Amino acid sequence: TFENYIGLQDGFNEMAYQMVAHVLTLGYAVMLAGLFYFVLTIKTVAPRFRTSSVLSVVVMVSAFLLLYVQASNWTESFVFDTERGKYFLGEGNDLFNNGYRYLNWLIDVPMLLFQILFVVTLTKSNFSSIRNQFWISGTGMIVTGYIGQFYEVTDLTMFAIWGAISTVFFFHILWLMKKVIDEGKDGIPAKAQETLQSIWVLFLVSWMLYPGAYLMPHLAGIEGLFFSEIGVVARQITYTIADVSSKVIYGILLTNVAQVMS
Amino acid sequence: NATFENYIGLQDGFNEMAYQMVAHVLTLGYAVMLAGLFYFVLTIKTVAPRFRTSSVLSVVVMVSAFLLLYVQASNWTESFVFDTERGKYFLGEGNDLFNNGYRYLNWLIDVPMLLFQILFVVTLTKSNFSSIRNQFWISGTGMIVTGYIGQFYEVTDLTMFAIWGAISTVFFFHILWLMKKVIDEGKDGIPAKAQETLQSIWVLFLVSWMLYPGAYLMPHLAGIEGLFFSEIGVVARQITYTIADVSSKVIYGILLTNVAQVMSK
Ligand SMILES: *C/C=C(C)/C=C/C=C(C)/C=C/C1=C(C)CCCC1(C)C
Ligand SMILES: *C/C=C(C)/C=C/C=C(C)/C=C/C1=C(C)CCCC1(C)C
Protein backbone atom coordinates (compact mmCIF):
# COMPACT_ATOMS: atom_id res chain seq x y z
CA THR A 1 0.00 0.00 0.00
CA PHE A 2 2.71 2.45 -1.03
CA GLU A 3 0.43 4.95 -2.78
CA ASN A 4 -1.92 4.98 0.22
CA TYR A 5 0.93 5.78 2.62
CA ILE A 6 2.06 8.78 0.57
CA GLY A 7 -1.51 9.73 -0.32
CA LEU A 8 -2.53 10.02 3.34
CA GLN A 9 0.70 11.21 5.00
CA ASP A 10 2.32 13.67 2.58
CA GLY A 11 -0.49 14.13 0.07
CA PHE A 12 -0.25 14.73 -3.67
CA ASN A 13 0.35 18.02 -5.43
CA GLU A 14 -1.77 19.13 -8.38
CA MET A 15 0.93 18.25 -10.93
CA ALA A 16 1.55 14.77 -9.50
CA TYR A 17 -2.15 13.90 -9.21
CA GLN A 18 -3.08 15.11 -12.70
CA MET A 19 -0.03 13.43 -14.26
CA VAL A 20 -0.81 9.93 -12.94
CA ALA A 21 -4.39 10.49 -14.13
CA HIS A 22 -3.36 11.69 -17.60
CA VAL A 23 -0.67 9.02 -17.99
CA LEU A 24 -3.14 6.28 -17.03
CA THR A 25 -5.71 7.82 -19.38
CA LEU A 26 -3.61 7.77 -22.55
CA GLY A 27 -2.61 4.34 -21.27
CA TYR A 28 -6.07 2.97 -21.90
CA ALA A 29 -6.24 5.15 -25.02
CA VAL A 30 -3.37 3.35 -26.74
CA MET A 31 -4.82 0.02 -25.58
CA LEU A 32 -7.95 0.73 -27.63
CA ALA A 33 -5.66 1.98 -30.40
CA GLY A 34 -3.77 -1.32 -30.41
CA LEU A 35 -7.10 -3.17 -30.33
CA PHE A 36 -8.18 -1.28 -33.46
CA TYR A 37 -5.01 -2.52 -35.17
CA PHE A 38 -5.31 -6.18 -34.19
CA VAL A 39 -8.91 -6.40 -35.44
CA LEU A 40 -7.89 -4.82 -38.75
CA THR A 41 -4.92 -7.18 -39.25
CA ILE A 42 -6.80 -10.42 -38.62
CA LYS A 43 -7.22 -11.31 -42.30
CA THR A 44 -3.78 -9.85 -43.03
CA VAL A 45 -2.35 -13.07 -41.57
CA ALA A 46 -2.98 -16.71 -42.44
CA PRO A 47 -5.46 -18.77 -40.38
CA ARG A 48 -2.52 -20.38 -38.56
CA PHE A 49 -1.53 -17.03 -37.00
CA ARG A 50 -5.03 -15.72 -36.25
CA THR A 51 -4.95 -17.21 -32.75
CA SER A 52 -2.09 -14.85 -31.89
CA SER A 53 -4.07 -11.79 -33.01
CA VAL A 54 -7.05 -12.89 -30.90
CA LEU A 55 -4.74 -13.29 -27.91
CA SER A 56 -3.49 -9.79 -28.66
CA VAL A 57 -7.14 -8.70 -28.89
CA VAL A 58 -8.07 -10.35 -25.58
CA VAL A 59 -4.99 -8.80 -23.95
CA MET A 60 -6.02 -5.41 -25.34
CA VAL A 61 -9.45 -5.44 -23.66
CA SER A 62 -8.09 -6.50 -20.27
CA ALA A 63 -5.30 -3.90 -20.23
CA PHE A 64 -7.74 -1.17 -21.28
CA LEU A 65 -10.27 -2.06 -18.57
CA LEU A 66 -7.47 -2.26 -16.01
CA LEU A 67 -5.95 1.07 -17.05
CA TYR A 68 -9.50 2.44 -17.38
CA VAL A 69 -10.55 1.34 -13.88
CA GLN A 70 -7.27 2.41 -12.30
CA ALA A 71 -7.62 5.80 -13.99
CA SER A 72 -11.15 6.19 -12.65
CA ASN A 73 -10.14 4.87 -9.22
CA TRP A 74 -7.20 7.30 -9.11
CA THR A 75 -9.51 10.22 -9.94
CA GLU A 76 -11.98 9.32 -7.17
CA SER A 77 -9.72 7.94 -4.43
CA PHE A 78 -7.88 11.18 -3.58
CA VAL A 79 -9.91 14.24 -2.61
CA PHE A 80 -8.45 17.74 -2.81
CA ASP A 81 -7.91 19.67 0.43
CA THR A 82 -8.33 23.44 0.31
CA GLU A 83 -6.29 24.39 3.39
CA ARG A 84 -3.20 22.31 2.60
CA GLY A 85 -3.40 22.65 -1.19
CA LYS A 86 -2.86 18.92 -1.76
CA TYR A 87 -4.83 15.81 -2.71
CA PHE A 88 -5.18 13.29 0.13
CA LEU A 89 -6.56 9.77 0.28
CA GLY A 90 -10.24 9.60 1.17
CA GLU A 91 -13.00 7.17 2.02
CA GLY A 92 -14.93 4.88 -0.19
CA ASN A 93 -14.98 1.47 -1.62
CA ASP A 94 -13.31 1.02 -5.01
CA LEU A 95 -10.15 2.84 -3.92
CA PHE A 96 -7.01 2.88 -6.05
CA ASN A 97 -4.97 -0.29 -5.47
CA ASN A 98 -1.83 -1.11 -7.45
CA GLY A 99 -2.35 -4.77 -6.53
CA TYR A 100 -5.25 -4.95 -8.98
CA ARG A 101 -2.54 -4.57 -11.64
CA TYR A 102 -0.92 -7.75 -10.29
CA LEU A 103 -4.08 -9.85 -10.65
CA ASN A 104 -4.37 -8.60 -14.24
CA TRP A 105 -0.84 -9.83 -14.96
CA LEU A 106 -1.80 -13.21 -13.48
CA ILE A 107 -3.78 -13.88 -16.67
CA ASP A 108 -2.16 -11.38 -19.07
CA VAL A 109 1.35 -12.80 -18.56
CA PRO A 110 0.50 -16.37 -19.76
CA MET A 111 -1.35 -14.99 -22.79
CA LEU A 112 1.57 -12.73 -23.73
CA LEU A 113 3.79 -15.77 -23.16
CA PHE A 114 1.52 -18.18 -25.06
CA GLN A 115 0.85 -16.15 -28.20
CA ILE A 116 4.49 -16.29 -29.28
CA LEU A 117 4.28 -20.09 -29.23
CA PHE A 118 1.38 -19.73 -31.70
CA VAL A 119 3.56 -17.59 -33.98
CA VAL A 120 6.89 -19.37 -33.51
CA THR A 121 7.62 -23.02 -34.29
CA LEU A 122 9.35 -25.23 -31.72
CA THR A 123 12.37 -27.23 -32.88
CA LYS A 124 13.82 -29.85 -30.48
CA SER A 125 11.23 -28.84 -27.86
CA ASN A 126 7.61 -29.94 -27.45
CA PHE A 127 4.90 -27.28 -27.39
CA SER A 128 3.26 -28.76 -24.28
CA SER A 129 6.15 -28.60 -21.79
CA ILE A 130 7.23 -25.10 -22.88
CA ARG A 131 3.68 -23.76 -22.63
CA ASN A 132 3.17 -25.70 -19.40
CA GLN A 133 6.34 -24.37 -17.77
CA PHE A 134 5.49 -20.86 -18.97
CA TRP A 135 2.16 -21.17 -17.17
CA ILE A 136 3.38 -22.41 -13.79
CA SER A 137 6.46 -20.16 -13.63
CA GLY A 138 4.85 -16.91 -14.77
CA THR A 139 1.89 -17.61 -12.50
CA GLY A 140 4.31 -18.46 -9.70
CA MET A 141 6.23 -15.27 -10.48
CA ILE A 142 3.15 -13.08 -10.13
CA VAL A 143 1.55 -14.72 -7.08
CA THR A 144 4.64 -14.47 -4.87
CA GLY A 145 5.45 -11.02 -6.22
CA TYR A 146 1.84 -10.17 -5.41
CA ILE A 147 2.50 -11.37 -1.85
CA GLY A 148 5.68 -9.32 -1.45
CA GLN A 149 3.97 -6.04 -2.34
CA PHE A 150 1.73 -6.48 0.73
CA TYR A 151 4.90 -5.95 2.79
CA GLU A 152 6.09 -2.99 0.68
CA VAL A 153 6.03 -0.70 3.73
CA THR A 154 5.05 -2.62 6.86
CA ASP A 155 7.79 -5.27 6.56
CA LEU A 156 10.68 -4.61 4.17
CA THR A 157 12.24 -7.96 5.12
CA MET A 158 9.32 -10.06 3.84
CA PHE A 159 9.14 -7.70 0.86
CA ALA A 160 12.69 -8.90 0.17
CA ILE A 161 12.34 -12.70 0.45
CA TRP A 162 9.03 -12.91 -1.42
CA GLY A 163 10.14 -10.44 -4.08
CA ALA A 164 13.33 -12.44 -4.55
CA ILE A 165 11.58 -15.81 -4.84
CA SER A 166 9.65 -14.38 -7.80
CA THR A 167 12.65 -12.87 -9.58
CA VAL A 168 14.07 -16.37 -10.00
CA PHE A 169 10.65 -17.35 -11.36
CA PHE A 170 11.25 -14.38 -13.65
CA PHE A 171 14.68 -15.75 -14.55
CA HIS A 172 12.88 -19.01 -15.34
CA ILE A 173 10.66 -17.12 -17.82
CA LEU A 174 13.66 -15.66 -19.64
CA TRP A 175 15.33 -19.09 -19.60
CA LEU A 176 12.32 -20.72 -21.29
CA MET A 177 11.67 -17.73 -23.55
CA LYS A 178 15.20 -17.63 -24.98
CA LYS A 179 14.92 -21.02 -26.68
CA VAL A 180 11.49 -20.08 -28.05
CA ILE A 181 13.20 -17.13 -29.74
CA ASP A 182 16.28 -19.16 -30.66
CA GLU A 183 14.62 -22.32 -32.01
CA GLY A 184 11.92 -20.36 -33.79
CA LYS A 185 14.44 -17.97 -35.35
CA ASP A 186 16.46 -20.23 -37.65
CA GLY A 187 14.57 -21.62 -40.62
CA ILE A 188 12.47 -18.51 -41.33
CA PRO A 189 13.69 -15.40 -43.24
CA ALA A 190 16.48 -13.59 -41.40
CA LYS A 191 14.51 -10.32 -41.31
CA ALA A 192 11.86 -12.10 -39.23
CA GLN A 193 14.65 -13.29 -36.92
CA GLU A 194 15.84 -9.69 -36.58
CA THR A 195 12.28 -8.74 -35.66
CA LEU A 196 12.21 -11.68 -33.23
CA GLN A 197 15.46 -10.50 -31.61
CA SER A 198 14.01 -7.01 -31.23
CA ILE A 199 11.02 -8.80 -29.70
CA TRP A 200 13.43 -10.46 -27.25
CA VAL A 201 15.32 -7.35 -26.13
CA LEU A 202 11.99 -5.51 -25.90
CA PHE A 203 10.70 -8.48 -23.89
CA LEU A 204 13.78 -8.31 -21.65
CA VAL A 205 13.62 -4.56 -21.00
CA SER A 206 9.87 -4.10 -20.51
CA TRP A 207 9.53 -7.04 -18.12
CA MET A 208 12.28 -5.55 -15.93
CA LEU A 209 10.24 -2.37 -15.46
CA TYR A 210 7.68 -4.32 -13.43
CA PRO A 211 10.20 -5.29 -10.71
CA GLY A 212 11.91 -1.96 -11.39
CA ALA A 213 8.75 -0.10 -10.43
CA TYR A 214 8.44 -2.65 -7.62
CA LEU A 215 11.79 -1.12 -6.56
CA MET A 216 10.78 2.53 -7.07
CA PRO A 217 9.89 3.25 -3.38
CA HIS A 218 13.27 1.89 -2.24
CA LEU A 219 15.61 2.86 -5.10
CA ALA A 220 17.27 6.08 -3.82
CA GLY A 221 17.79 4.25 -0.57
CA ILE A 222 15.07 2.75 1.59
CA GLU A 223 13.13 6.04 2.31
CA GLY A 224 14.87 8.54 -0.06
CA LEU A 225 13.69 10.85 -2.83
CA PHE A 226 11.48 8.08 -4.24
CA PHE A 227 9.61 7.32 -0.99
CA SER A 228 7.63 10.45 -1.91
CA GLU A 229 4.92 11.41 -4.38
CA ILE A 230 7.47 11.48 -7.22
CA GLY A 231 8.12 7.80 -6.51
CA VAL A 232 4.37 7.28 -6.90
CA VAL A 233 4.34 9.28 -10.13
CA ALA A 234 7.48 7.52 -11.40
CA ARG A 235 5.92 4.11 -10.72
CA GLN A 236 2.76 4.76 -12.72
CA ILE A 237 4.50 6.24 -15.78
CA THR A 238 6.91 3.26 -15.76
CA TYR A 239 3.97 0.84 -15.71
CA THR A 240 2.37 2.73 -18.60
CA ILE A 241 5.73 2.75 -20.41
CA ALA A 242 5.98 -0.99 -19.81
CA ASP A 243 2.34 -1.78 -20.65
CA VAL A 244 2.54 -0.29 -24.15
CA SER A 245 5.88 -2.02 -24.70
CA SER A 246 4.90 -5.38 -23.21
CA LYS A 247 1.56 -5.65 -24.94
CA VAL A 248 0.92 -3.25 -27.84
CA ILE A 249 4.46 -3.05 -29.25
CA TYR A 250 5.07 -6.71 -28.36
CA GLY A 251 1.90 -7.83 -30.14
CA ILE A 252 2.40 -5.50 -33.11
CA LEU A 253 5.83 -7.06 -33.61
CA LEU A 254 4.52 -10.63 -33.27
CA THR A 255 2.07 -9.82 -36.07
CA ASN A 256 4.77 -8.46 -38.40
CA VAL A 257 6.50 -11.82 -38.02
CA ALA A 258 3.20 -13.59 -38.79
CA GLN A 259 2.70 -11.31 -41.80
CA VAL A 260 6.22 -11.95 -43.10
CA MET A 261 5.61 -15.70 -42.80
CA SER A 262 2.31 -14.99 -44.64
CA ASN B 1 -15.24 -28.03 -39.01
CA ALA B 2 -18.08 -25.95 -40.49
CA THR B 3 -20.29 -23.09 -39.32
CA PHE B 4 -24.07 -23.30 -39.63
CA GLU B 5 -24.10 -20.30 -41.98
CA ASN B 6 -21.18 -21.73 -43.97
CA TYR B 7 -22.79 -25.13 -44.56
CA ILE B 8 -26.09 -23.59 -45.69
CA GLY B 9 -24.29 -21.03 -47.86
CA LEU B 10 -22.11 -23.67 -49.53
CA GLN B 11 -24.60 -26.54 -49.92
CA ASP B 12 -28.15 -25.15 -49.94
CA GLY B 13 -27.54 -21.53 -50.90
CA PHE B 14 -29.57 -18.40 -50.23
CA ASN B 15 -32.61 -17.12 -52.07
CA GLU B 16 -32.81 -13.37 -52.61
CA MET B 17 -35.17 -12.64 -49.70
CA ALA B 18 -33.04 -14.42 -47.09
CA TYR B 19 -29.77 -13.01 -48.47
CA GLN B 20 -31.09 -9.45 -48.36
CA MET B 21 -32.74 -9.89 -44.94
CA VAL B 22 -29.44 -10.79 -43.24
CA ALA B 23 -27.72 -7.70 -44.65
CA HIS B 24 -30.82 -5.66 -43.79
CA VAL B 25 -30.82 -6.75 -40.14
CA LEU B 26 -27.03 -6.34 -39.98
CA THR B 27 -27.16 -2.80 -41.37
CA LEU B 28 -30.03 -1.99 -39.01
CA GLY B 29 -27.69 -3.27 -36.28
CA TYR B 30 -24.82 -0.83 -36.77
CA ALA B 31 -27.31 1.95 -37.49
CA VAL B 32 -28.73 1.48 -33.98
CA MET B 33 -25.15 1.48 -32.68
CA LEU B 34 -24.38 4.75 -34.47
CA ALA B 35 -27.64 6.25 -33.20
CA GLY B 36 -26.94 5.08 -29.65
CA LEU B 37 -23.51 6.70 -29.93
CA PHE B 38 -25.32 9.99 -30.52
CA TYR B 39 -27.36 9.54 -27.34
CA PHE B 40 -24.37 8.69 -25.16
CA VAL B 41 -22.17 11.57 -26.34
CA LEU B 42 -25.18 13.88 -26.00
CA THR B 43 -25.96 12.73 -22.43
CA ILE B 44 -22.41 12.68 -21.00
CA LYS B 45 -23.13 16.04 -19.35
CA THR B 46 -26.36 14.85 -17.67
CA VAL B 47 -24.49 13.01 -14.88
CA ALA B 48 -21.90 13.87 -12.28
CA PRO B 49 -18.28 13.27 -13.34
CA ARG B 50 -18.00 9.96 -11.46
CA PHE B 51 -20.63 8.37 -13.75
CA ARG B 52 -19.11 9.51 -17.04
CA THR B 53 -16.80 6.49 -16.91
CA SER B 54 -19.93 4.43 -17.58
CA SER B 55 -21.18 6.70 -20.37
CA VAL B 56 -17.80 6.73 -22.14
CA LEU B 57 -17.68 2.94 -21.80
CA SER B 58 -21.04 2.84 -23.58
CA VAL B 59 -19.54 5.03 -26.31
CA VAL B 60 -16.64 2.58 -26.61
CA VAL B 61 -19.10 -0.33 -26.78
CA MET B 62 -21.04 1.51 -29.50
CA VAL B 63 -18.00 2.26 -31.68
CA SER B 64 -16.61 -1.28 -31.67
CA ALA B 65 -20.06 -2.85 -32.03
CA PHE B 66 -20.87 -0.50 -34.90
CA LEU B 67 -17.53 -1.14 -36.62
CA LEU B 68 -17.66 -4.91 -36.20
CA LEU B 69 -21.33 -5.20 -37.16
CA TYR B 70 -20.39 -3.02 -40.14
CA VAL B 71 -17.70 -5.43 -41.35
CA GLN B 72 -20.16 -8.33 -41.10
CA ALA B 73 -22.61 -6.47 -43.34
CA SER B 74 -19.85 -5.75 -45.86
CA ASN B 75 -18.50 -9.31 -45.68
CA TRP B 76 -21.98 -10.79 -46.22
CA THR B 77 -22.30 -8.76 -49.43
CA GLU B 78 -18.85 -9.66 -50.77
CA SER B 79 -18.54 -13.32 -49.71
CA PHE B 80 -21.50 -14.67 -51.75
CA VAL B 81 -21.75 -15.13 -55.52
CA PHE B 82 -25.07 -15.26 -57.36
CA ASP B 83 -25.74 -18.42 -59.43
CA THR B 84 -28.08 -17.91 -62.44
CA GLU B 85 -28.74 -21.68 -62.75
CA ARG B 86 -30.20 -22.01 -59.22
CA GLY B 87 -31.38 -18.45 -58.66
CA LYS B 88 -29.55 -18.58 -55.32
CA TYR B 89 -26.52 -17.10 -53.59
CA PHE B 90 -23.61 -19.44 -52.86
CA LEU B 91 -20.44 -18.77 -50.90
CA GLY B 92 -17.51 -19.06 -53.31
CA GLU B 93 -13.73 -18.80 -53.66
CA GLY B 94 -13.30 -20.53 -50.31
CA ASN B 95 -15.08 -17.71 -48.48
CA ASP B 96 -15.82 -18.91 -44.95
CA LEU B 97 -17.69 -15.78 -43.78
CA PHE B 98 -14.62 -15.50 -41.50
CA ASN B 99 -16.16 -18.38 -39.49
CA ASN B 100 -18.41 -15.72 -37.92
CA GLY B 101 -15.25 -14.32 -36.36
CA TYR B 102 -16.42 -10.70 -36.41
CA ARG B 103 -19.59 -11.61 -34.51
CA TYR B 104 -17.61 -13.48 -31.86
CA LEU B 105 -14.85 -10.86 -31.86
CA ASN B 106 -17.58 -8.29 -31.20
CA TRP B 107 -18.85 -10.26 -28.20
CA LEU B 108 -15.31 -10.91 -26.95
CA ILE B 109 -14.70 -7.15 -26.83
CA ASP B 110 -18.03 -5.80 -25.61
CA VAL B 111 -19.07 -8.35 -22.95
CA PRO B 112 -16.40 -7.36 -20.37
CA MET B 113 -17.12 -3.68 -20.99
CA LEU B 114 -20.86 -4.18 -20.53
CA LEU B 115 -20.26 -6.03 -17.26
CA PHE B 116 -17.55 -3.65 -16.03
CA GLN B 117 -19.49 -0.42 -16.51
CA ILE B 118 -22.30 -1.10 -14.03
CA LEU B 119 -19.75 -1.03 -11.20
CA PHE B 120 -18.91 2.55 -12.25
CA VAL B 121 -22.54 3.54 -11.61
CA VAL B 122 -23.64 1.22 -8.81
CA THR B 123 -22.13 1.42 -5.31
CA LEU B 124 -21.22 -1.75 -3.40
CA THR B 125 -21.73 -2.31 0.34
CA LYS B 126 -20.29 -5.76 1.06
CA SER B 127 -18.46 -7.01 -2.05
CA ASN B 128 -14.91 -6.47 -3.30
CA PHE B 129 -14.95 -4.42 -6.52
CA SER B 130 -11.68 -5.91 -7.81
CA SER B 131 -12.79 -9.51 -7.32
CA ILE B 132 -16.16 -8.88 -9.00
CA ARG B 133 -14.35 -7.35 -11.98
CA ASN B 134 -11.90 -10.26 -12.20
CA GLN B 135 -14.73 -12.82 -12.09
CA PHE B 136 -16.75 -10.83 -14.65
CA TRP B 137 -13.78 -10.81 -17.02
CA ILE B 138 -12.88 -14.48 -16.55
CA SER B 139 -16.45 -15.68 -17.00
CA GLY B 140 -17.25 -13.31 -19.86
CA THR B 141 -14.08 -14.11 -21.80
CA GLY B 142 -14.32 -17.87 -21.33
CA MET B 143 -17.97 -17.81 -22.40
CA ILE B 144 -17.27 -16.21 -25.78
CA VAL B 145 -14.03 -18.13 -26.37
CA THR B 146 -15.71 -21.48 -25.70
CA GLY B 147 -18.71 -20.29 -27.71
CA TYR B 148 -16.52 -19.59 -30.74
CA ILE B 149 -14.76 -22.95 -30.41
CA GLY B 150 -17.94 -25.01 -30.10
CA GLN B 151 -19.62 -23.11 -32.94
CA PHE B 152 -17.40 -25.05 -35.37
CA TYR B 153 -18.98 -28.37 -34.28
CA GLU B 154 -22.68 -27.46 -34.51
CA VAL B 155 -23.08 -29.37 -37.79
CA THR B 156 -20.30 -31.96 -37.38
CA ASP B 157 -19.46 -33.28 -33.89
CA LEU B 158 -22.49 -33.05 -31.59
CA THR B 159 -20.36 -34.41 -28.73
CA MET B 160 -17.80 -31.61 -29.09
CA PHE B 161 -20.61 -29.10 -29.71
CA ALA B 162 -22.16 -30.14 -26.39
CA ILE B 163 -18.97 -30.19 -24.31
CA TRP B 164 -17.99 -26.66 -25.34
CA GLY B 165 -21.54 -25.30 -25.26
CA ALA B 166 -22.10 -26.75 -21.79
CA ILE B 167 -18.86 -25.08 -20.69
CA SER B 168 -20.09 -21.75 -22.05
CA THR B 169 -23.25 -22.14 -19.95
CA VAL B 170 -21.11 -22.60 -16.82
CA PHE B 171 -19.49 -19.21 -17.43
CA PHE B 172 -22.94 -17.85 -18.33
CA PHE B 173 -24.82 -19.05 -15.24
CA HIS B 174 -21.93 -17.62 -13.23
CA ILE B 175 -22.35 -14.19 -14.86
CA LEU B 176 -26.09 -14.17 -14.14
CA TRP B 177 -25.43 -14.98 -10.49
CA LEU B 178 -22.82 -12.22 -10.28
CA MET B 179 -24.90 -9.56 -12.05
CA LYS B 180 -27.78 -10.43 -9.71
CA LYS B 181 -25.60 -9.71 -6.67
CA VAL B 182 -24.26 -6.37 -7.93
CA ILE B 183 -27.77 -5.14 -8.71
CA ASP B 184 -29.34 -6.38 -5.47
CA GLU B 185 -26.47 -4.84 -3.48
CA GLY B 186 -26.46 -1.54 -5.37
CA LYS B 187 -30.14 -1.06 -4.57
CA ASP B 188 -29.38 -0.60 -0.86
CA GLY B 189 -29.41 3.06 0.16
CA ILE B 190 -30.35 4.65 -3.18
CA PRO B 191 -33.69 6.27 -4.14
CA ALA B 192 -36.47 3.79 -4.89
CA LYS B 193 -36.75 5.09 -8.46
CA ALA B 194 -33.20 3.95 -9.19
CA GLN B 195 -33.98 0.68 -7.39
CA GLU B 196 -36.91 0.17 -9.77
CA THR B 197 -34.74 0.99 -12.79
CA LEU B 198 -32.04 -1.36 -11.51
CA GLN B 199 -34.60 -4.18 -11.44
CA SER B 200 -35.67 -3.37 -15.01
CA ILE B 201 -31.95 -3.47 -15.80
CA TRP B 202 -31.71 -6.93 -14.23
CA VAL B 203 -34.76 -8.25 -16.09
CA LEU B 204 -33.48 -6.73 -19.34
CA PHE B 205 -30.02 -8.18 -18.69
CA LEU B 206 -31.50 -11.60 -17.91
CA VAL B 207 -33.77 -11.72 -20.98
CA SER B 208 -31.48 -10.13 -23.58
CA TRP B 209 -28.37 -12.14 -22.70
CA MET B 210 -30.56 -15.26 -22.64
CA LEU B 211 -31.34 -14.69 -26.33
CA TYR B 212 -27.83 -15.74 -27.42
CA PRO B 213 -27.92 -19.35 -26.11
CA GLY B 214 -31.57 -19.31 -27.17
CA ALA B 215 -30.63 -18.94 -30.84
CA TYR B 216 -27.62 -21.30 -30.60
CA LEU B 217 -27.97 -23.92 -27.85
CA MET B 218 -31.70 -24.14 -27.05
CA PRO B 219 -32.73 -25.37 -30.55
CA HIS B 220 -30.66 -28.50 -29.98
CA LEU B 221 -31.72 -28.81 -26.33
CA ALA B 222 -35.42 -28.94 -27.23
CA GLY B 223 -35.13 -31.05 -30.38
CA ILE B 224 -36.34 -28.26 -32.68
CA GLU B 225 -33.09 -28.30 -34.66
CA GLY B 226 -33.50 -29.74 -38.13
CA LEU B 227 -36.58 -27.63 -38.68
CA PHE B 228 -34.20 -24.64 -38.63
CA PHE B 229 -31.30 -26.26 -40.54
CA SER B 230 -31.99 -24.07 -43.57
CA GLU B 231 -31.82 -20.48 -44.77
CA ILE B 232 -34.73 -19.79 -42.40
CA GLY B 233 -32.60 -20.70 -39.39
CA VAL B 234 -29.69 -18.53 -40.52
CA VAL B 235 -31.99 -15.50 -40.76
CA ALA B 236 -33.82 -16.36 -37.53
CA ARG B 237 -30.57 -16.60 -35.56
CA GLN B 238 -29.11 -13.39 -37.01
CA ILE B 239 -32.33 -11.49 -36.28
CA THR B 240 -32.28 -12.87 -32.73
CA TYR B 241 -28.60 -11.94 -32.28
CA THR B 242 -29.23 -8.41 -33.56
CA ILE B 243 -32.27 -7.83 -31.35
CA ALA B 244 -30.23 -9.18 -28.43
CA ASP B 245 -27.31 -6.81 -29.20
CA VAL B 246 -29.52 -3.72 -29.37
CA SER B 247 -31.06 -4.72 -26.06
CA SER B 248 -27.85 -5.77 -24.29
CA LYS B 249 -25.79 -2.80 -25.44
CA VAL B 250 -27.94 0.20 -26.34
CA ILE B 251 -31.02 -0.25 -24.16
CA TYR B 252 -28.78 -1.48 -21.33
CA GLY B 253 -26.58 1.61 -21.52
CA ILE B 254 -29.58 3.95 -21.67
CA LEU B 255 -31.04 2.58 -18.43
CA LEU B 256 -27.61 2.92 -16.80
CA THR B 257 -27.58 6.66 -17.52
CA ASN B 258 -31.11 6.92 -16.05
CA VAL B 259 -29.81 5.34 -12.81
CA ALA B 260 -26.74 7.60 -12.86
CA GLN B 261 -28.95 10.65 -13.53
CA VAL B 262 -31.20 9.83 -10.55
CA MET B 263 -28.14 9.29 -8.31
CA SER B 264 -26.52 12.45 -9.82
CA LYS B 265 -29.33 14.44 -8.14
C1 LIG C 1 1.33 -6.90 -19.35
C2 LIG C 1 2.04 -7.16 -18.03
C3 LIG C 1 3.28 -7.72 -17.85
C4 LIG C 1 4.03 -8.37 -18.96
C5 LIG C 1 3.77 -8.12 -16.53
C6 LIG C 1 4.96 -8.67 -16.17
C7 LIG C 1 5.39 -9.02 -14.82
C8 LIG C 1 6.66 -9.19 -14.36
C9 LIG C 1 7.81 -9.53 -15.24
C10 LIG C 1 6.98 -8.79 -13.00
C11 LIG C 1 7.19 -9.63 -11.96
C12 LIG C 1 7.81 -9.31 -10.67
C13 LIG C 1 9.11 -9.56 -10.40
C14 LIG C 1 10.07 -10.17 -11.36
C15 LIG C 1 9.73 -9.26 -9.08
C16 LIG C 1 8.76 -9.29 -7.93
C17 LIG C 1 7.44 -8.61 -8.21
C18 LIG C 1 6.88 -8.67 -9.64
C19 LIG C 1 5.58 -9.47 -9.62
C20 LIG C 1 6.54 -7.23 -10.00
C1 LIG D 1 -23.05 -7.51 -26.73
C2 LIG D 1 -22.52 -8.91 -26.67
C3 LIG D 1 -23.14 -9.86 -25.95
C4 LIG D 1 -23.98 -9.45 -24.78
C5 LIG D 1 -23.04 -11.31 -26.18
C6 LIG D 1 -23.07 -12.26 -25.23
C7 LIG D 1 -23.24 -13.69 -25.43
C8 LIG D 1 -23.88 -14.54 -24.60
C9 LIG D 1 -24.58 -14.09 -23.37
C10 LIG D 1 -24.00 -15.96 -24.96
C11 LIG D 1 -23.09 -16.92 -24.86
C12 LIG D 1 -23.29 -18.34 -25.17
C13 LIG D 1 -23.80 -19.24 -24.30
C14 LIG D 1 -24.27 -18.93 -22.93
C15 LIG D 1 -23.97 -20.70 -24.62
C16 LIG D 1 -23.63 -21.10 -26.03
C17 LIG D 1 -22.53 -20.23 -26.58
C18 LIG D 1 -22.88 -18.74 -26.56
C19 LIG D 1 -21.62 -18.01 -26.99
C20 LIG D 1 -24.00 -18.42 -27.57
Numbering used by the authors:
A (entry chain A): 8 to 269
B (entry chain B): 6 to 270
Source paper text:
NaR belongs to the microbial rhodopsin family, whose members are widespread in the microbial world. In the dark state, all microbial rhodopsins contain all-trans retinal, which is bound to a specific Lys residue on the seventh helix (G helix) via a protonated Schiff base (PSB). During this photocycle, NaR achieves outward Na+ transport.
We herein solved the structure of a NaR from the bacterium Indibacter alkaliphilus (hereafter, this NaR is abbreviated as IaNaR) and then found unique features in one protomer of the asymmetric dimer. The crystals belonged to the P212121 space group, and the asymmetric unit contained two antiparallel protomers, which will be referred to as molecules A and B, respectively. The overall structures of the two protomers were similar to the reported KR2 structures, that is, they commonly contain a short N-terminal helix (N helix; residues 9–17) and consist of typical seven transmembrane domains. In molecule B, the three-residue cluster at the EC surface is disrupted, and in the vicinity of the PSB, the Arg108 sidechain lacks the interaction with Asp250 and is oriented toward the EC side. These differences from molecule A seem to be related to the large outward bending of the F' helix caused by unnatural interprotomer interactions. The EC end of this F' helix forms a hydrophobic interaction with the A helix (the first helix) from molecule B of the neighboring asymmetric unit. For IaNaR, the corresponding Asp115 is also oriented downward in both protomers, while the distances to the Schiff base nitrogen are somewhat longer (3.9 Å and 3.4 Å for molecules A and B, respectively).
